[PDB]
Amino acid sequence: GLTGETKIRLESSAQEIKDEINKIKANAKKEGVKFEAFTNTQTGSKISEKPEFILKAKIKAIQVAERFVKAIKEEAEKLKKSGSSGAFSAMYDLMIDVSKPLEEIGIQKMTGTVKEAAQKTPATTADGIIAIAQAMEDKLNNVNKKQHDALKNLKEKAKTATTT
């Protein structure tokens, strides 16, 4: 039968977005590009000057990321009618748990900030958390506006010589 967890959505775990992003990993296999160079490619980009593949996931990675901070503020609304900081511990403690592997996409940055947000707006309630969502969202703008800047560069180097 055709795969489709969303249909069941029993666990409702952060497994949904996990498969979506993981797509950039498999998609790379078809890119042919030297993945191992994904890091050293920056310097090698001198000749290739076509880091469109690398800049493809980085942008598509941050874009989808906005999906999390959105879910965080939601689960918080459930802490209001609950008033049980206990539930927050399970959901909150899950951050590192889900953010640990997520590193596979290089987003464990904006998240790591969540900790610092625990100093200004304590998650002692759904109100504080809802706010903490802004802290993470603020980062998305820093990387989105900074990352896209690199992509634009390739615009100036645009040439018809590209591809045979």
Side-chain angles (χ1 to χ4, degrees):
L2 296 169
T3 313
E5 189 272 84
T6 161
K7 296 181 177 63
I8 287 61
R9 195 179 294 173
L10 181 135
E11 298 293 340
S12 313
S13 289
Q15 293 178 314
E16 292 290 338
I17 3 66
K18 284 273 178 69
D19 181 61
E20 191 70 19
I21 58 189
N22 179 59
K23 186 170 63 165
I24 63 112
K25 290 174 64 274
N27 179 256
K29 295 274 272 179
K30 310 298 195 66
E31 286 290 338
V33 182
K34 188 170 181 178
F35 327 132
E36 296 179 1
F38 176 96
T39 309
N40 313 145
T41 293
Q42 295 291 88
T43 300
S45 183
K46 201 85 89 189
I47 316 308
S48 304
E49 61 172 326
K50 285 273 272 292
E52 297 177 357
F53 156 50
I54 294 169
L55 296 167
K56 187 175 181 179
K58 287 180 174 180
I59 57 183
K60 188 174 181 295
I62 55 184
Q63 285 286 124
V64 59
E66 81 200 345
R67 179 58 47 191
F68 279 107
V69 304
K70 284 175 178 180
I72 309 308
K73 50 173 293 206
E74 286 174 355
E75 296 293 308
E77 294 177 3
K78 284 54 164 294
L79 222 300
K80 195 177 185 294
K81 57 179 176 46
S82 193
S84 68
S85 64
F88 174 74
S89 305
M91 295 189 273
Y92 179 77
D93 293 343
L94 202 86
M95 274 46 214
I96 315 99
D97 307 354
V98 67
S99 184
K100 257 280 176 173
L102 192 90
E103 68 192 327
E104 61 186 352
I105 198 66
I107 274 174
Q108 57 184 163
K109 313 183 183 298
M110 55 199 74
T111 66
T113 310
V114 72
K115 186 177 181 177
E116 187 176 14
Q119 285 58 39
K120 185 68 162 58
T121 42
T124 56
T125 306
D127 292 342
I129 303 173
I130 287 165
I132 293 168
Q134 295 176 326
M136 294 179 287
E137 184 172 45
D138 292 345
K139 291 275 274 178
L140 307 180
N141 293 340
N142 181 299
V143 298
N144 176 49
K145 291 180 176 63
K146 186 175 181 178
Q147 186 66 40
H148 284 214
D149 189 47
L151 191 83
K152 263 67 184 68
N153 183 235
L154 280 60
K155 199 85 174 61
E156 301 293 272
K157 296 180 180 179
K159 204 86 87 183
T160 62
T162 184
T163 309
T164 67

